[PDB]
Amino acid sequence: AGEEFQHILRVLNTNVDGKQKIMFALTSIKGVGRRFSNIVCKKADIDMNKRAGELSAEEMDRLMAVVHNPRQFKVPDWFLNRKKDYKDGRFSQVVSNAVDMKLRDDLERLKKIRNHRGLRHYWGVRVRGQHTKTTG
Amino acid sequence: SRVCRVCGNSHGLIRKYGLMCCRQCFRSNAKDIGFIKYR
Amino acid sequence: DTQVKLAVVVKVMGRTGSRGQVTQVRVKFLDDQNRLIMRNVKGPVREGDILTLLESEREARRLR
């Protein structure tokens, strides 16, 4: 009995399932894996044996508080996916749509550079040194 | 920078135990060195 | 109708089939211990096994 039990959650433009446990429901956001979702579920102090959907919203606001300010809740430097940015220089946690946004800004940088990796990206060939006689 | 002591070749070199012979010179001289084919 | 009859391999004769996967044995009927007939069996079999026959009439021939 979850009388206000939600099955859709729309957190951060990701359409989170209300039918799953929290630490695997919040992984639906593009930029949060199982490890970061675990850290969020810990620092916001949420019972992890709780289905996302049985939640209270005031908890949810804290979830977004920790995800948008990962540096602020003492989440360490090495944990974040934007270590030592090149456009600015900050240690950030890029989230759902900015992951794609930043990614295409990087490949655009390498394209304008005439970088080797930029041209490998543009040509559609593999970029990390793998062999390609018989793979692809 | 590592050659056969017997022929100065660069391929198939046996450096185990300090032999530093190529796999063919070692076969030609195995019995003289003392390596016996038991099994 | 048919009734399943019960027989005993009394001697084992040989190995028939293209690939030798079938044995030929002589069986003996337990209710009528006078009717001894040739049958083909699939699977390992020694002297003394009890064979269940769905029908009794069919009788094999030498080196079948």
Added chain:
Amino acid sequence: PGGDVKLFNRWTFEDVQVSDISLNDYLAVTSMKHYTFLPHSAGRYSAKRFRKAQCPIIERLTNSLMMHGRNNGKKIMAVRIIKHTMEIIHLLTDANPIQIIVDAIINSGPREDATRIGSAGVVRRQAVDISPLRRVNQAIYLLTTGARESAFRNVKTIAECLADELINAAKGSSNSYAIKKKDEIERVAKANR
């Protein structure tokens, strides 16, 4: 019947009755030499023909669980599986689960088959009998394969799938994989009698 050695120290080997005289010599539950605490005996069978007619039936069934590669060699898991299967079986039939297992093995063995033999000069498939040992072999094969095929991609545990398979085959009900396969083999055999 003074035989106080019991499977897992729970299931009495006294009072197990094999009805088929045909396979009575090829199921190892009736004599005292074949009673065991556990179905994991590091036996040196397969060394001679017909040795595995002496291997305890519970061990044969357990041996047939460790199948499909990712389960090869995993005998302790199969012994635990059989343990839970047996607890469930007696938690359904309230009867000695050895008897249920033995009845299922007997009931799930085909008695006819059809194979291509050469008659008088031309090859074509005739019907043949099944030896008792290959009857037991095929019976275990069918039950285990049925249980393993039920358990795949299912929330049902392999122990419970096996228990349902064995109780259904012991009933003889034509709902377990073992019975349907037995009857289909025997129908293909009858068709070419």
Added chain:
Amino acid sequence: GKQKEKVNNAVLFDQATYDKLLTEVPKYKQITPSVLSERLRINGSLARRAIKDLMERGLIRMVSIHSSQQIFTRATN
């Protein structure tokens, strides 16, 4: 069926399994494991492995626990 997604419907904590369903489910053989009934009564587990605990706290049916998450049942005796 979806018996871990079904763990938090209104029904699942109103009366559903609290003797409204599992009065009978063990009793078809008087004794049927809750881990056996995961499919015969199509309802699966962990909306159901946390209620076999609740019947324990409620003093209704005894159990055994083992390796593969095997769990068992007996209605009343």
Added chain:
Amino acid sequence: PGTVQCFGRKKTAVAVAYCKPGRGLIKVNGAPIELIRPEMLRLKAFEPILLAGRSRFKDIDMRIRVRGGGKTSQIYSIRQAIAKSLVAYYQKYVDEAAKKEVKEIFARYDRTLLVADPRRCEPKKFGGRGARARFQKSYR
């Protein structure tokens, strides 16, 4: 005076049972035999004690040191250790006839509580990864 020290062997595991005239004690590596811990193969270690009876062990303490092999091989080695140690104790201290008794109870149940398996792991030969298996062959 009773003391014997008898071993039991399997694939590579070996167990050795040292015997004293004590009360009921059986300990493998210092822990009670009740706690040899693959528990599915626990009735296997208890096979001799229930084969003879706890009563036949009312006046010996067994310290069984086991080593080598793996979990199952160590269990079978311990099995052989209890069995042959009891046989040797009844040989040297109790009686020649009541050791024949226990020998017959032990060797009617299983001949490898007293005789070890000569089976070893067959070496590997080149051309495949295994004793008998070979690399998969391709023609075209």
Added chain:
Amino acid sequence: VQHRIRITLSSKSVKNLEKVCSDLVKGAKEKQLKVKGPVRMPTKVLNITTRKSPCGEGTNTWDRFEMRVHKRVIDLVSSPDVVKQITSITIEPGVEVEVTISD
């Protein structure tokens, strides 16, 4: 006046080693010395597996070559001169004699 003298022998051949090893022990048995030996240490097998073919054609067949090395130890209590008197007899080829003084 009595030390702890350890004499260590190594060889590729069992018999040539054991002849000398017995000879030393008996030569030190006539002097009523304390000979604590011979101690046998695990045979060391130096193994090299090599492809028979020089050119990499045909069935890949290997030959495994092995040198067995045996390690004996004899213990004595004496002065180094008496032992040097003893370890001066005719030594078979291939045997190493490497006498030292243990602590």
Added chain:
Amino acid sequence: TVKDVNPHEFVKAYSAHLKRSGKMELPEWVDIVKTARFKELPPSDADWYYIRAASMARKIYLRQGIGIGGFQKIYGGRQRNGSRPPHFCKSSGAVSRNILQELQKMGIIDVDPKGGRLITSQGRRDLDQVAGTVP
């Protein structure tokens, strides 16, 4: 004593001891570290440090002179490399060192000359006391 109790219930009993027996410090990274390079998630149970302590003081109580580069092998395991074969990997030395340092800062164990770590007389005492109280 400790060898007369099953080592699972004993570790449960001891890890409940250190909890309600006073306290120890706990780092400010206990909720975030994985305990092994090959692990996927941190330990599932929030009370894992104490478990890792109670399981670990039984290692020194049954052995003598175990360093940290041996505990890393003790608690290491199988690492799966995706598409490459899996191998054996060692756990993290920071938790291994920190729990021993804490056992020192309670007097259950102590560092050993000749290297390693050894159980103390008082540390032996409480382990057999708690062992006496396990079913």
Added chain:
RNA sequence: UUCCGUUAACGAACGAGACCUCAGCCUGCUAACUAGCUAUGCGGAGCCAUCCCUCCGCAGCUAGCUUCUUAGAGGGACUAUGGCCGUUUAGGCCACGGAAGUUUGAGGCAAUAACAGGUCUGUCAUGCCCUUAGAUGUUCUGGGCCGCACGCGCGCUACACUGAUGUAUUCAACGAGUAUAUAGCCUUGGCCGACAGGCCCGGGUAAUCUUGGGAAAUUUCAUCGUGAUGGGGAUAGAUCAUUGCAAUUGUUGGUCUUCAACGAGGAAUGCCUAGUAAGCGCGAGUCAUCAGCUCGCGUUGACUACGUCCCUGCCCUUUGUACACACCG
């Protein structure tokens, strides 16, 4: 082509066998502080508490110590004994015993004759030819050998609940360790660090130190719940560190993030008969760094058969032949 025997053959030579290596049995022999077990002493901890009892530590002129470990000398199996079939020969099947009764298992070695098999790119092995200074010689710098619409071969990871994850728990064997510069090859121990990795005090040329090699699968208790899911981990971004003179078409190892195909696979096809297949990990070779390979090693441990000549071939005989480069005639 092993033997009995037959017999225009008699007497011999190789190959098979014998032989050698490893594994299997030995409370029998020789021993062993670079292996240990036992007892006794002291040390700790429990406790009917004072002793006794249990579990560890430590030291020796404890052993009428060598069972366990190591490695030497030997012993042991010969089908020896019994039954049945057989010239009642050579042999065969069955059985008690026994560690072992397929030659006990597994290897090494291995005939005549041949191939236009492969190797001139292992060899200062070699004939002939070509070149030999503006070099096809040598050495340096940079690039390629790795490039990618595609076809093929050996494989690695998987498609999940007989499971993944996270605790607890914990059992091997075979091997390896160049003065390795001034701590250096294998690296214990202590400290810093989330990891990666780093600093310091050290051992070992080794049954002595790494390393009783504290392996994994497995076992255990939880979490997942039939969902391309928490199965799977490809592709990719950022960032840290290591090796090396230099890491770019990422050497490799870490952290967070990205979450592809894949729903057990058509025709075809490979390997396999017992500690075997399969599963699991470990060592060595290569090596400054890199193992999805190869060569070994242990661990867990089956299904089926104990046949046949149907398919693919092989040996011997008889037979036909217009084949002899020999039916790809």
